[PDB]
Design a protein around this ligand. Structure first.
Ligand SMILES: NC(=O)c1ccc(-c2cc([C@H]3C[C@@H]4CC[C@H]3N4)cnc2F)cc1
Ligand SMILES: NC(=O)c1ccc(-c2cc([C@H]3C[C@@H]4CC[C@H]3N4)cnc2F)cc1
Ligand SMILES: NC(=O)c1ccc(-c2cc([C@H]3C[C@@H]4CC[C@H]3N4)cnc2F)cc1
Ligand SMILES: NC(=O)c1ccc(-c2cc([C@H]3C[C@@H]4CC[C@H]3N4)cnc2F)cc1
Ligand SMILES: NC(=O)c1ccc(-c2cc([C@H]3C[C@@H]4CC[C@H]3N4)cnc2F)cc1
Ligand SMILES: *[C@@H]1O[C@H](CO)[C@@H](O)[C@H](O)[C@H]1NC(C)=O
Ligand SMILES: *[C@@H]1O[C@H](CO)[C@@H](O)[C@H](O)[C@H]1NC(C)=O
Ligand SMILES: O=C([O-])C(=O)[O-]
Lengths: 206, 209, 206, 205, 205
């Protein structure tokens, strides 16, 4: 309708696109995971496949509007191609991430943005011992590929992974799943990089 | 020809694209399934592969026209890129959906749209006992990913899935299948979300009953 | 060369694209198949894989020209993305069709268009018995996905599938292969739909 | 830098794109193969997988220039999307060809173009006997899909396939590899079609 | 924000895009590898699968700017499609390379560009004997596909591959990993081509 069409036009067609965060105007991205299934374990390559969805949240000044000038609209759905999105990357993936959900985000009038992509990820993980009582632990770090802590900081609202949608007839049951902010120093690069460490302990269901 | 070119120019070139539904102007989408084949079952990963086509139907005021002004055209075929389509998503898929049919919809002069994508889906299903007489039951929810019940509502014209085109020499025979509207509350989000729940009961092709 | 550049400019840049057939201006598409190979049979999923090319031919008034006004040019090759092409679809496929030839068509001065895509198709077929003398029969319907018989009719020039290019060292030999126009109704839709039914009888090579 | 930006602007941004060859102005494409590996043999489906690169060469008047008018530039690299390229197709492929090299060509001042795509190809081949001393022979034709011999002719500079880059630890050794022009008639079509027939004899190492 | 939007507009919207290096304006690209995992070995096809990231660095005058004129910005992140990038190719790949990281580079005020793509590569490698204590050695050359040594030269900062992110529970342990500039003369082409040779010696853990 007319009001939403005006708002989208005023936000996206007038200005050039947001060029991303800088040292003077840094950005904090909130991350959270909802784990749906450990689909597959490969003991001959030490790869494990997860299905999850990842809640991403950030805020920009350039996406603010006054609701009363646009028919009391407080939020709207928009294609993720119309906006900047953070370059969050699994640091130990072995295949390109597969997208399982529409590339659509929600923008709120205060400038906040929320994007919740469902994904299937293959990553490095040794499953030896998964058929035992103690189970096995594996971890994967999620963070910006190209932005140091001076441009992108991360945090979580909770260190507990949401397990309320976990597939009840999975081959594997979860013993614990946590999501924790940490600071990393890489050999390539003298600046600190932030990531959220997803740590999942699991075993064969029996 | 001339009259259709004129109609498509007037609908798509003059105005900006429809920005999707809102709370003030919500939308109801009708869904229905025609199940063609259960292609395979993976008992080591609890994945099942379905081939089906999915009838989607909705109505917009912005796609209305008077047929008298356009050579009595009452409908037309158009690329699904030319129009908004609902973001209907399987909630327990394990692979991206594969598209098996041309991305083309039919628009009618009252503003109603019909779009019938044929798809192959891998989703989460435990096939233990599929080789029994009783068979196994599995389910997958289809609904909007991003829109709550305040912007998108769903319904079916019937709760009976169409099985009249099911592949007769499939490895799996279908005993029954239903498609039912339901309301969901996810822990991420306070608003109700609407889905259609596809339930399929099946077993390895034998037989008895 | 100057004449062809003029012709293509006059046909494609002076007008909007052809919007496809209608009830008032319907179209007949001629189909024929040339079967190259039955590559693979999967008896665990009842899928079979063919390689073939599919001659498509139709005629539009909007693609006519006088050869004497364009240096006696009687036909030309053009990208299939520059023209409308029919949405011919296999009705029992189990995977997206794979394209094995360049997406180029030939337009003739009478307005006729010929497009001959080579394809690999996986489709529903029970191969049980293929290792016997009687072999096995399988079938797949090809037709428009969205256009009824009132907008697109189909026909064939012959009911015999061309086997003159069939791979002589294939695992499978062809006993017969036919292509036949059919009409039927679907529950979705009030009008009849036209298809061409590809019926192939084959057995393991002896 | 400035002289190359001028030359490219003058060749591509002025005139419309080359519309391909015609009966009045036909084109000869030179083909040659460099075989890197026979990677895979599937005896259950009679498919074989090659990795190779394929030298394609042709010449157009609309790509000519005088070096002296452009800072002594005698050739340049450009995206293969910026130009027309020939629709050379394997006639017995069973999968889409996989592209293993960047889509960049080299244009020279006489109007000649050279494009050398690296490719992995699955094609129809019965490998029964590959484990013997005699080995097995397999063949695949490369030619235009849509142009007859009246618009596109083919040739080779040599009948021998270049084997100097063949992988020394491949499962298969090459006994011979030739590339030969031939004329073909298909039942679809009354005109002759030209192809280069790649014939490779090989056995297990 | 305002200053970065001005700078990007001034670098990418004012001028035509860089047309790549020439003989009069050659370019040197620095390469370095960080090996993360030997994921897979296929002893029936002699293919091996590596996961790594590859640091690429080069420098262009046309990407230079004065920080004082742009709010003291010394560098910025930009999409790799907005800039020219070198066509670095693995010369013995058997499949298209898979991209595992965002296609974003960092440009610095002196005109230097750094791009560090994460990749998965299948390449030709005989793994027979990987289950022994001696292990096996494999090599793959990385260089420009279309530019000779007269337009693109390569170098490394160090001969030693970075193994500090190597997956500790990999099926395979690394015995050595080096990256070495070499000069190649191919039978197709009479000019020298530069590559960096990645040599990895490994065995089952
Ligand atoms: N300040 C700079 O000039 C700069 C900063 C960062 C990079 C950069 C770093 C990286 C690495 C940091 C972490 C660890 C591996 C990968 N992600 C990737 N891509 C990049 F472009 C390049 C140049
Ligand atoms: N009111 C808001 O600001 C809002 C509303 C909806 C979302 C949103 C929700 C979702 C979730 C709802 C259901 C359950 C999981 C996924 N599908 C996905 N993507 C989204 F953008 C984000 C923000
Ligand atoms: N008259 C209309 O409003 C109309 C007509 C046709 C369609 C339509 C039909 C179909 C079905 C007909 C055949 C059988 C399955 C699929 N192909 C697919 N896609 C479509 F858009 C939709 C609406
Ligand atoms: N003269 C014409 O009107 C004409 C000429 C050629 C074609 C054509 C031929 C072909 C076949 C010839 C060879 C054998 C299989 C495939 N390549 C493919 N695609 C085409 F468009 C169509 C129409
Ligand atoms: N000067 C020229 O006319 C020229 C120069 C280079 C090429 C060229 C070379 C190559 C080869 C060099 C290395 C060895 C195999 C492949 N990569 C690939 N693609 C190309 F376009 C073509 C023409
Ligand atoms: C928006 O809010 C105002 C203030 O409460 C109200 O009067 C008005 O009816 C609302 N709706 C529109 C469409 O303006
Ligand atoms: C081109 O080559 C000539 C002859 O060697 C040389 O004298 C001249 O300086 C060159 N011109 C340019 C513009 O580089
Ligand atoms: O004539 C036709 O082609 C028709 O009516 O479909």
């Amino acid at each position: 309708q007319a009001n939403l069409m005006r708002l989208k036009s005023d936000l996206f067609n007038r200005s050039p696109m947001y060029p991303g965060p800088t040292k003077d105007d840094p950005l904090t991205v909130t991350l959270g995971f909802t784990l749906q299934d450990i689909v597959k374990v490969d003991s001959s390559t030490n790869e494990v496949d997860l299905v999850y969805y990842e809640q991403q949240r950030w805020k920009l000044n350039s996406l603010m509007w006054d609701p009363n000038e646009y028919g009391n609209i407080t939020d709207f759905r928009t294609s993720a191609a119309d906006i900047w999105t953070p370059d969050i990357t699994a640091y130990s993936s072995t295949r390109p991430v597969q997208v399982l959900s529409p590339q659509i985000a929600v923008v709120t009038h205060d400038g906040s943005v929320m994007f919740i992509p469902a994904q299937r990820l293959s990553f490095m993980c040794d499953p030896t011992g998964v058929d035992s009582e103690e189970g096995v632990t594996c971890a994967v770090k999620f963070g910006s590929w190209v932005y140091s802590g001076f441009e992108i900081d991360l945090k979580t609202d909770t260190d507990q992974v949401d397990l309320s949608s976990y597939y009840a007839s999975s081959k594997y049951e979860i013993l614990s799943a946590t999501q924790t902010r940490q600071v990393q120093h890489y050999s390539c690069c003298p600046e600190p990089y932030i990531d959220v460490n997803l740590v999942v302990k699991f075993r064969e269901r029996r």
